[PDB]
Enzyme design. Structure first.
Site, PDB file in Angstrom:
ATOM      1  N   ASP C 274       0.859  -1.327   0.070  1.00 47.77           N
ATOM      2  CA  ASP C 274      -0.096  -0.087  -0.019  1.00 47.77           C
ATOM      3  C   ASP C 274       0.685   1.473  -0.132  1.00 47.77           C
ATOM      4  O   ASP C 274       0.198   2.394  -0.247  1.00 47.77           O
ATOM      5  CB  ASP C 274      -0.956  -0.040   1.195  1.00 47.77           C
ATOM      6  CG  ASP C 274      -2.517   0.413   0.741  1.00 47.77           C
ATOM      7  OD1 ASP C 274      -3.097   0.859   1.771  1.00 47.77           O
ATOM      8  OD2 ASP C 274      -2.896   0.429  -0.587  1.00 47.77           O
ATOM      9  N   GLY C 409      -6.554  12.894   0.785  1.00 49.54           N
ATOM     10  CA  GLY C 409      -6.557  13.625  -0.433  1.00 49.54           C
ATOM     11  C   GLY C 409      -6.996  12.787  -1.580  1.00 49.54           C
ATOM     12  O   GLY C 409      -7.888  13.176  -2.188  1.00 49.54           O
ATOM     13  N   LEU C 410      -6.443  11.591  -1.591  1.00 53.53           N
ATOM     14  CA  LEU C 410      -6.744  10.630  -2.634  1.00 53.53           C
ATOM     15  C   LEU C 410      -8.382  10.193  -2.525  1.00 53.53           C
ATOM     16  O   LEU C 410      -9.169  10.144  -3.561  1.00 53.53           O
ATOM     17  CB  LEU C 410      -5.900   9.463  -2.560  1.00 53.53           C
ATOM     18  CG  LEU C 410      -6.156   8.205  -3.603  1.00 53.53           C
ATOM     19  CD1 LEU C 410      -5.813   8.426  -4.895  1.00 53.53           C
ATOM     20  CD2 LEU C 410      -5.505   7.016  -2.718  1.00 53.53           C
TER      21      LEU C 410
END
Ligand code: SF4
Ligand code: SF4
Lengths: 414, 417, 419, 414
Positions: C274, C409-410
């Protein structure tokens, strides 16, 4: 040293670690703006969709699951009346939907619910505003991307009939990719050209005995069949990944439409040079590195082909969950001849193969990725390759980037 | 049939997996379809594990309808390959609809280690039941009456794999028991091997950390091992105090606390916190975390508790009992649309809940903190982050208050434009 | 003079208060105007203190402009002794009293009280808060540290932990642990937690851990000359820098490096799959010299961000930082003008910014993700929960803090992109 | 039982824990949209504004500070040239500003910079677009709210002359409050009525021998003086806190304007009943509780009056940093007779009186609040009463809420 047309493919059966076709609903419903995908299945199915959809689940997506309860099992019943009530409840609170998909699960198949009869009756009760189809996405019959295939193939029989000689590009692609594709083909003078699936239900393509179609995605066996069943003819081509893949893809289309090498090299040289330079940035960390690909998507053969020929990778074992001999032939023709090819899998067997091979990069699912990293192997999780724009010219450098990145990070962390 | 988008809980077999992956030297074999391995991902990704879960599936498919043989090879292959101390076998929802009997098949095979079969009602029960049951079953199959250890010792019960803050809660409770002379015997299922399970009998008593994943097995231990188990879960300073009192009664040992790092009572008493007073809070999540959250909100921080409920049927009684004490009717549902509706009706100023409530909160421009599963990667953190005991209280305070000051901050800042 | 809205640092006397409040049984007396008490609030509110800081002001006003003023500081010094009977005192001037005639030195010697009274020089028109802290601590140390016999056990001093220190409380806790894990016990920790009597006992430590250069270096040096005590040059923020710290301690003591790594999860977290999309992400880093240097090594060498800017407001750390930033092919940005920062970030333009409560705002203005790594900071960054930056839990804590705003943010990107 | 006009007030002078006038700029610039407040001071000054502005600092507010550097001390050259440069820099970067305020600090006064001469020269250089004023906000000269007073008083001399008999309400109030006030007065038939300060520089009120003003805020001694110096006449009234205060405030105006008790009771009865219902909610936890107020704002006497008379609180020691005998007369008349009054302070002495008194509720600054809590005393920090709307009818219940809240929270936390 290139050519794999005659190499033995290991047909393996055993413990399998793959996603079911239900997953396909995730990228697929985005493309088809009019559609809704209703899975008839268990809470397990609901859960999978959720896991598979991550953030999206909160963005009121046009998919859902008619979760089978205790009394839907218990025989007879109106499994069909239940279904009908839920569908009406659905179509009302959602009148935007113009085509509705009853997507069959393992539970729904083992219970033998006639989802086709269901789709039929429901088309009746909700015409003309809504057309309802039926198709299987179950683990029993479908691996991951294969759910796209079964969906499109279910749409094909019902498509409008025509006698016009038109080109259909088959396979849901990102809109930027779809556009670049559409542009180049217009520049080459092929026209008019339409996608399956289309962005909306009202502008689906027509099919007839003079229709030509070319595949943008390897996993479209069933759709090919149903299109051929209507009289349409496929253009064989390797899949448009990398500079070579795209040029060969485009060329196959140009050739079938009698486009002079004149107009071809004109339209294509700019985009090509751009594509080849973008790839070089990655040639550094990529060349000479050995590659392993577990089976997930049917994209692995053409991507192994792109990685070997354009990025200088050395192939190892490339596994696919399903291998259509005819469709894959173009790409098998350009894959390095050393390649151990595998269709299906037995997890523990294949992992032993992997351990022994000791490859520099491994493509796999999320369930395998971290465990492999922990044991020293750099990985690149497969699922990224269905959502990221990867096909055609402008995304070629980005494509190779997907594979350089992990190696660069493994390098950088020590 | 029920139209379903969001689900708070998996099928029960994910609960089974949660017990298996929690343990060591135990292999779970699940009869299910090619595709059933998707849960793998939860463990390797959300809990960021460095090993495939000790779970294997028979993974049958379309061509196989004609399969009892498959489960048999699957059971066989797992033993041959991993030589575990013990195994468990059960059915996926799809294989619940099939003929094959896990009990009959595993006794036919007759392996040199125990194989526990599990009943998982995939059309009536969910994840937590799965976990409670698997844990209970494993315990009935291995816990023997035993001689009490010379020193005072206890078991930690119910800590599993995809447990919200189980890792650090285990760490924290161990600490406060040790500050009181009690040493931990075995912790199960988290960290335990089947051999550890056989040694459960020798503890004086049981800490039931998480009712929804350990109660069953705690009861078995009460009748089977004469082991009393704690009813109070130590989340919140007050509830931690009473937990300690509860342990005193059980052991006879005096309550001893290291409060040198307990900062929550002062923070909340501190002048800054005066505008927290009367703030309307909506609380949703899993029975256990909701009950604890409400005591903290009312008696410790000074919020007004304006709504209380949970998704897990199993805790509906303790929750109704508890909510009642706030003049409140408990909301029991697993339909996020029922929650959305209730929140709107209650109009809170803060929401305490799950990933879903996080989202509802954003939809309604409201501040929000997460108090229980189901949760995303974020809430399986690298940093020390318990909910239990004193550090628990500290952590809780920062998590809840933060989104309120941010809200005040955003408000005021845009209000100066 | 220069137009000023935001200021990274207070006047030096605030630094003085940071030393005094950090200590116990020490009274500071500051000659200053009615109004000077405003910094009281900083300790009471941000550090959420339960007692008013051991600081008293002469509190002169308009009507006092006359011989009255020397007399006022005299009473002030007198009243503080009478009332609190502290083991030692310090006395200095506010910016406005720096313009007056009254000499703190002469006046406290005139008064002649039964405990030491350390005068301090605070150049309030040339230096700032951290200077104030470094000098006050230095001064107190010069005034009290005597050569002494080394303890039988291996022991060290923790040097530079003050009051409005960003993560000082839990950093002190964490460094104590990793030294203990290695056989070393802490002698005294100063300024934070120490009394003037503890400061007298400094000499008997084998060596000094210099936790925060900008608030302890001076005093560390005095202790090198005056006490033959060497001091650690590496500050243990980040797994790598923590290792080196431990190596550095090994050299100094002779003892072998011993680590309890059972809870160290940052290396795996960022090795984890990740974390792959963290690779190559452009980070801008600003704050206080010490924290920025540390943050850069973690970003480049530990997490895999590309460091695309580095600077600090702290003029004192200009050299260490230019030295450091050079290694990244980067020119250091030395400024205290948030507008230069705002301009630098824009030219940079990063994907993540690591900085100060000001940069949190700039980040907001620019719709960019952001994490706080250094003072000045508000209430929220003086937390109730354990939150160090140093050592292994430091790494863990840093990883969570930095990654969070990127995943948000993503998340907000993706879900807006889904409508 | 009520009446304090004759009570000896303890004039204390010693260590003081109060904010300086610079703070006033924080609420004050918000009300004067056209204005910019430039402090000529040290970094200390800059830092205090920062601390006192908290979040607002990031909201591009219309104040700043020309911070004195080493060269500005060192003798008389260019302090004024340097100031001029910075002002020019400022006014170009911000052309919206129509009034500029040179706000004097301790450092600027000890240095004897002639901020007046500076204001005048700069009014010259930047006419007609910008008028520049000068006034002191230094700790040496002002306590907290006294900064508003000095500011306003500096504006007065330059206000336009008029001969119309108009009402001026003096003191920055919230726009909510200001409008409620404005409405009631129009409904009573008083007009026309203007605020000092006005929302914009172009609608500042005029002053003449026929002008009447009333104070909305106790801390306006200087402005009173300058207003009177121009010929205006003050309406004496207690301050409009609580139902009583507002009624009596409004009554005083009505009286001076000869409005029938019919019209007064008509306009006023609805909002009054509303006001005194809202206060009852708080009467529960408030009645019988002893009150202590440290000196901060000059609002403490009338607030003590409101707490005792309308919420049944018992006064103890009520301290104010400054006590204008004539302005505060109406409110002193209504304060309970037992009240020990203090002007100024000696912190340690007062704290001994506090400890000795053991009051149920203590009003104080942030620097004392937590330490007192720690020691067992319930507190209410004073600084909230200058930012929160507290005056007039609709805010009355809210006002009582500010004091009830801490007591209910101390109650609730055990
Ligand atoms: S594998 Fe079958 S039962 Fe499982 S989620 Fe997929 S369709 Fe549903
Ligand atoms: S008291 Fe004087 S020197 Fe201090 S901040 Fe206020 S104006 Fe500046």
């Amino acid at each position: 040293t290139f050519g794999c047309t005659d190499s033995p493919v290991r047909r393996e059966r055993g413990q399998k670690a793959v996603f079911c076709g239900l997953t396909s609903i995730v990228w697929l419903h985005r493309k088809m703006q009019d559609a809704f995908f209703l899975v008839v299945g268990s809470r397990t199915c609901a859960h999978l969709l959720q896991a598979a959809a991550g953030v999206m689940i909160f963005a009121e997506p046009r998919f859902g699951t008619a979760v089978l309860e205790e009394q839907d099992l218990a025989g007879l019943a109106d499994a069909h009346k239940e279904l009908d009530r839920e569908v009406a409840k659905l179509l009302e609170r959602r009148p935007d939907i113009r085509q509705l998909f009853l997507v069959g699960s393992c539970p729904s198949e083992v219970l033998k619910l006639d989802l086709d009869r269901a789709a039929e009756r429901l088309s009746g009760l909700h015409a003309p505003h809504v057309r309802v189809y039926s198709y299987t996405g179950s683990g029993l019959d479908t691996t991951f991307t294969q759910g796209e295939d079964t969906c499109l193939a279910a749409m094909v029989p019902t498509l409008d009939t025509t006698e016009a000689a038109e080109l259909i590009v088959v396979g849901a692609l990102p809109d930027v990719v779809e556009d670049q594709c559409l542009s180049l083909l217009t520049q080459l003078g092929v026209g008019p050209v339409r996608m399956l699936p289309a962005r909306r239900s009202d502008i689906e393509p027509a099919v007839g005995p003079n229709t030509r179609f070319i595949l943008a995605q390897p996993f479209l066996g069933e759709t090919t069949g149903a299109l051929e069943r209507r009289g349409a003819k496929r253009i064989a081509a390797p899949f448009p990944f990398g500079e070579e893949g795209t040029t060969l893809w485009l060329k196959a289309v140009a050739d079938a439409y009698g486009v002079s090498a004149e107009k071809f090299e004109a339209v294509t040289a700019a985009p090509r040079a751009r594509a080849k330079k973008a790839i070089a940035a990655h040639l550094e960390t990529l060349t000479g590195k050995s590659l392993f690909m577990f089976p997930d998507s049917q994209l692995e053969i053409p991507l192994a082909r792109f990685l070997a020929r354009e990025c200088g990778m050395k192939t190892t074992e490339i596994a696919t969950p399903f291998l259509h001999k005819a469709i894959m032939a173009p790409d098998l023709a350009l894959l390095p001849s050393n390649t151990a090819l595998t269709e299906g899998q037995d997890l523990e067997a294949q992992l032993d193969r992997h351990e022994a091979i000791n490859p520099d990069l491994t493509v796999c699912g999320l369930g395998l990725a971290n465990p492999l990293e922990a044991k020293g192997h750099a990985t690149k999780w497969a699922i990224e390759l269905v959502f990221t724009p990867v096909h055609f010219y402008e995304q070629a450098g980005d494509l190779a980037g997907l594979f350089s990145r992990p190696l660069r990070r493994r390098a950088l962390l020590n | 049939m029920k139209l379903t988008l969001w689900t708070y809980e998996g099928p029960p077999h994910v609960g089974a997996m949660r017990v298996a992956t929690a343990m060591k030297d135990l292999q779970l074999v699940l009869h299910g379809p090619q595709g059933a391995t998707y849960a793998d991902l939860l463990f390797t990704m959300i809990e960021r594990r460095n090993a495939r879960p000790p779970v294997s599936f028979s993974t049958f498919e379309a061509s196989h309808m004609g399969t009892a043989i498959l489960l048999k090879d699957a059971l066989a292959a797992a033993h041959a390959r991993y030589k575990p101390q013990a195994m468990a076998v059960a059915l996926t929802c799809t294989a619940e609809l099939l003929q094959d009997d896990p009990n009959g098949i595993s006794r036919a095979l007759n392996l040199p280690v125990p194989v526990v079969p599990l009943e998982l009602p995939s059309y009536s029960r969910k994840e937590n039941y799965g976990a409670d049951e698997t844990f209970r079953a494993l315990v009935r199959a291995l816990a023997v009456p035993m001689e009490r250890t010379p020193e005072v010792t206890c078991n930690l019960l119910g800590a599993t794999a995809l447990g919200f803050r189980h890792r650090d809660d285990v760490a924290e409770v161990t600490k406060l028991l040790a500050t009181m002379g009690i040493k931990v015997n075995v912790c199960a299922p988290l960290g335990a091997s089947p051999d550890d399970l056989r040694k459960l009998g020798q503890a004086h008593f049981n800490v039931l950390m998480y009712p929804e994943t350990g109660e069953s097995a705690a009861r078995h231990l009460e009748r089977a091992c004469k082991q009393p188990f704690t009813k109070i879960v130590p989340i919140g300073v007050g509830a931690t105090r009473d937990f300690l009192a509860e342990v005193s009664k059980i052991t006879g040992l005096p309550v001893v606390t290291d409060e040198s790092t307990l900062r929550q009572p002062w923070w909340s008493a501190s002048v800054d916190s005066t505008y927290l007073t009367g703030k309307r809070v909506f609380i949703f999540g899993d029975g256990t975390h909701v009950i604890a959250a409400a005591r903290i909100a009312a008696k410790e921080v000074g919020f007004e508790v304006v709504g209380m409920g949970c998704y897990n049927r199993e805790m509906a009684r303790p929750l109704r009992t508890a909510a009642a004490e706030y003049g409140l009717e408990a909301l029991i549902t697993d339909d996020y649309l029922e929650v959305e509706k209730a929140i709107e009706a209650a109009a809170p100023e803060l929401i305490l809940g799950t990933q879903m409530e996080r989202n509802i909160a954003k939809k309604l421009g409201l501040p929000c903190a997460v108090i229980s599963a189901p949760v995303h990667v974020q809430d399986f953190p690298a940093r020390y982050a318990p909910q239990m005991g004193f550090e628990g209280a500290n952590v809780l305070f920062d998590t809840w208050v933060h989104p309120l000051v941010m809200g005040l901050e955003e408000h005021l800042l845009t209000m100066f434009r």
